[PDB]
Structures are given as C-alpha cells and as structure tokens.
Design a protein around this ligand. Structure first.
Ligand SMILES: O=C(CCl)Nc1ccc(/N=N/c2ccc(S(=O)(=O)O)cc2)cc1S(=O)(=O)O
Ligand SMILES: O=C(CCl)Nc1ccc(/N=N/c2ccc(S(=O)(=O)O)cc2)cc1S(=O)(=O)O
Ligand SMILES: O=C(CCl)Nc1ccc(/N=N/c2ccc(S(=O)(=O)O)cc2)cc1S(=O)(=O)O
Ligand SMILES: O=C(CCl)Nc1ccc(/N=N/c2ccc(S(=O)(=O)O)cc2)cc1S(=O)(=O)O
Ligand SMILES: O=C(CCl)Nc1ccc(/N=N/c2ccc(S(=O)(=O)O)cc2)cc1S(=O)(=O)O
Length: 127
C-alpha cells in the first residue's frame, strides 16, 4: 500500500497575503487546539499504510489535516480566513464520512470542532 503525497504547504503559483484573521487562526492552532490529546489523530496526514486502511484514499479524495493547516498558516499560504476555515471543515467532514457515528475518532473530531467553532465565533474583523 501507498500514501498519496501530502497536501501542498507552499505554492508560488497561488496568491497569498498576511491578515490579522490568519494570524488569529495560527495562534488558535498553536495555543488552543494543538495541545489537546483529542488532537493527536489530526496532527498529520492519515498514514493509511501504518493504519492498515487500504480503503482510506479510495473513500477520501480530499484529505486534510491540522499539520498541513498549521504549516500553511506559518508559511502564509492562504489568501483569506475562508480558505483556512474550509480546510478545517474538510478535515472534519472527512472524519465524519469515513468513520461510523459514535466511533471514538468521531468523538475526538467533535471535541476539536466544538473548540474550533468557539474560536471562529470570535474571529476578529479583518484589518
Ligand atoms: O514553482 C512553480 C510555479 Cl512558479 N511550480 C509549481 C507551483 C505549484 C505547484 N503545486 N503543486 C501542488 C502539489 C500538490 C497539491 S495537492 O496534493 O492538491 O495539495 C497542490 C499543489 C507545483 C509546482 S511545480 O510542479 O513544482 O513546478
Ligand atoms: O476571510 C475573510 C476575510 Cl474578510 N473573512 C471571513 C472568513 C470566514 C468567515 N467565516 N465565519 C464563520 C462563522 C461561523 C460559521 S459556523 O459556526 O459553522 O456557522 C462558519 C464560518 C468570516 C469572515 S468575516 O466575517 O468576513 O470576517
Ligand atoms: O450508515 C450509517 C453510518 Cl456508517 N449508519 C449508522 C449510523 C449510526 C450508527 N450508530 N451510531 C451510534 C452512535 C453512538 C452510539 S452510543 O455511543 O452507544 O451512544 C451508538 C451508535 C450506526 C450506523 S450503521 O452501523 O452503519 O448502520
Ligand atoms: O457527527 C455525528 C456523527 Cl457523523 N454525530 C452523531 C450523530 C448521531 C449519532 N447517533 N447516535 C445514536 C445512538 C444510539 C442509537 S440507539 O441506541 O440505537 O437508539 C442510535 C443513534 C451519534 C453521533 S456521534 O456519536 O456524536 O458521532
Ligand atoms: O501519523 C500519521 C502519519 Cl502522517 N497518521 C495517522 C493518522 C491518524 C491516526 N489514527 N487515527 C485513528 C482512527 C480511529 C481511531 S478510533 O476510532 O478511536 O479507533 C483512533 C485513531 C494514526 C496515524 S499513525 O498512527 O501516525 O499512522
């Protein structure tokens, strides 16, 4: 079995800029989300080889993870906060599509998402 290449975290072809909202999202990742135990399955791309889930990248064609998101934020990859929020929602949706409701991984994703939603409710107005 083989993993796909991980999502890009730099792209000289893709427009980008620094904004106060994206700095907010970076510190949300670094200072609020990452530190919880429930984050550990989401801190890196799914290793379908190690997990013995050969179906994973058959089912999930838009993989995303918080390790990728953190790097994108650190690297100023995004043009706006909507792009970053979309990446979080892709990560959560993948988990909910792939796993049975009630599975521990779904509960972990829901804990992470609850915290995430609390923070994006307080997203600062863009400067
Ligand atoms: O230096 C430039 C343009 Cl000035 N080239 C470039 C620019 C962007 C690029 N993007 N590559 C990827 C690779 C993977 C994904 S992903 O798996 O969908 O996340 C996205 C973009 C690849 C390349 S390149 O193939 O390495 O030339
Ligand atoms: O990217 C920018 C650059 Cl100005 N802005 C942005 C980007 C995303 C955004 N999304 N906010 C939310 C708020 C709540 C949910 S909800 O709880 O899942 O309904 C989703 C997105 C709000 C905004 S904003 O309201 O325009 O600041
Ligand atoms: O097509 C699906 C998802 Cl793959 N239907 C589904 C939907 C929900 C489900 N069971 N969910 C739960 C969730 C929580 C508990 S609990 O921890 O005992 O409260 C039990 C079942 C099982 C299934 S099912 O096992 O696949 O029929
Ligand atoms: O995000 C999701 C799944 Cl994608 N929420 C969800 C949605 C429905 C759900 N259903 N749980 C149950 C629990 C018990 C029964 S019963 O004992 O068979 O009546 C059915 C569904 C469990 C959950 S979950 O346990 O929080 O995953
Ligand atoms: O570290 C990587 C490689 Cl870039 N990926 C990864 C990604 C997720 C993961 N664990 N995922 C799950 C899935 C389901 C459950 S369960 O529902 O509680 O059984 C737990 C962890 C394990 C791993 S792994 O152990 O490191 O292979």
């Amino acid at each position: 079995s083989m993993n796909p290449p991980p999502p890009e975290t730099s792209n000289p072809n893709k427009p980008k800029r620094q904004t106060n909202q994206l700095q907010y999202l970076l510190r949300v990742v670094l200072k609020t989300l990452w530190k919880h135990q429930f984050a550990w399955p989401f801190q890196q791309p799914v290793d379908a080889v190690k997990l013995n889930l050969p179906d994973y990248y058959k089912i999930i064609k838009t993989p995303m993870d918080m390790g990728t998101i953190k790097k994108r934020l650190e690297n100023n990859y995004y043009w706006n906060a909507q792009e970053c929020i979309q990446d979080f929602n892709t990560m959560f949706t993948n988990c909910y599509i792939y796993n049975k409701p009630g599975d521990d991984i779904v509960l972990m994703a829901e804990a992470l998402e609850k915290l995430f939603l609390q923070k994006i409710n307080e997203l600062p107005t863009e400067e």
